[PDB]
Structure 1
């Protein structure tokens, strides 16, 4: 049903569905079994920053995740998104918890998309930047358990009043306007997404992760995509 391209910050190793034995960042092209992963030294309670970049000339989706004072983790995958996605897509953030949990807090999110045509000076562009989320964020489509406004942050999954993360939670936030990522006259199409997050768990084993994703405009959370499926995929195939 949905077409999903995502960059996951997977906190919990589900080795039975192909995760490596550690937190990792991965690039998912229509399956939760990442096409490429990289070890991520996830820091519980620390604010991290993820940068995702791509352009149609190189056809390489790359992501860099870093924590202050720490070395970054980066993952890249050669993929032509014109062959995977529709030309009009929606971009968003997704997160889930299952039996194990963590807060999936987003403190800021910026995205820039550019479609440059072969006509001189013809660039179409979309850019949004959120450094504060209000309770009435009308330009975001919140799905599942995602809420905004709490300390001006976006909480992708359920957090009880006392700051505790809840299990079996799934939430997604998508920018309201469709994003144009391909057009017949485009000579170069590119996008850049950056978001800072705070994954905090009272447990030694947080789960399940946050994912930046791009999908068909009408994408909705697949039934049963809590836990390991990151609110992105209906099954683990």
Structure 2
């Protein structure tokens, strides 16, 4: 499997290179983020994540913010053409471990362009109770509110621990081609994280992977349902 991800990491796992505080990170083929940034978490408040990449600039960048408050950013120099395959699926992923949190997605948009001019764009603001244009993996599901719940949440509303789930867009994305001048993509998603216990965990991610990607075994909690190993 080949994962490129932007992680909202709500729980620090110092035992695997994680900084000892909530952070946003850029993950290339490994949970140990190539670049992290301090995440000013606001549990209970709706947040927005924006992700951008351009094949000429070769800089993968992400920003996190809450309405009427300071934002935080992270960037990493990388040629994803030498990392990812030509065809990929894009998705959201989330996990809980010992510590719980709701991982609610209120909206999710993605745009990709490939000049050789081929484009794909999708935007979800309400998720149907049966999203045929989404591949739901793990414990991911959509509630009556039209929200996408990535991890387990009881009928009451409180999150469950040791949960893992993901949502992929159904159509593969031609992320780059050998006969391409420039390829670019932008993604955004709005999230709501609520936690009853003290420390929230584990986090939410946006990820690009090979088409046949699925939740690898033992990828719960700290590994955000993307990687089978910490290495």
Give the Cα separation in 1 of the matches to 2:2 and 2:199.
30
What is the CA-CA distance between 1:150 and the residue it aligns to? 3.2
Query: What is the DSSP-based 3-state SS (H/G/I as helix, E as strand, rest coil) of the residue aligned with 1:90?
Result: strand
Query: What is the DSSP-based 3-state SS (H/G/I as helix, E as strand, rest coil) of the residue aligned with 1:152?
Result: coil
The aligned counterpart of 1:233 is: 227
1:136–1:149: 8 Å Cα contact kept in structure 2? no
Give the Cα separation in 2 of the matches to 1:150 and 1:109.
17
Give structure 2 stretches of 5+ with no counterpart: none
Q: Which runs of 4+ in 1 moved over 3 A?
A: none
The aligned counterpart of 2:136 is: 142
Query: What is the DSSP-based 3-state SS (H/G/I as helix, E as strand, rest coil) of the residue aligned with 2:196?
Result: coil
1:73-109 CA distances to partner (integer Å, 9 max, x unpaired)?
1000001001111000000000000000100000000
The aligned counterpart of 1:60 is: 59
Query: What is the DSSP-based 3-state SS (H/G/I as helix, E as strand, rest coil) of the residue aligned with 1:74?
Result: strand
Give the Cα separation in 2 of the matches to 1:10 and 1:137.
27
Give the Cα separation in 2 of the matches to 1:232 and 1:43.
24
1:140-162 CA distances to partner (integer Å, 9 max, x unpaired)?
00000000143100000000011
Query: What is the DSSP-based 3-state SS (H/G/I as helix, E as strand, rest coil) of the residue aligned with 2:42?
Result: coil
Give the Cα separation in 2 of the matches to 1:112 and 1:152.
22
- Number of matched pairs: 231
Which of the residues 135, 158, 163 maps onto 2:157?
163
Give the Cα separation in 1 of the matches to 2:161 and 2:224.
13
TM-score normalised to structure 2 length: 0.99
The aligned counterpart of 1:13 is: 12
Query: What is the DSSP-based 3-state SS (H/G/I as helix, E as strand, rest coil) of the residue aligned with 1:43?
Result: coil
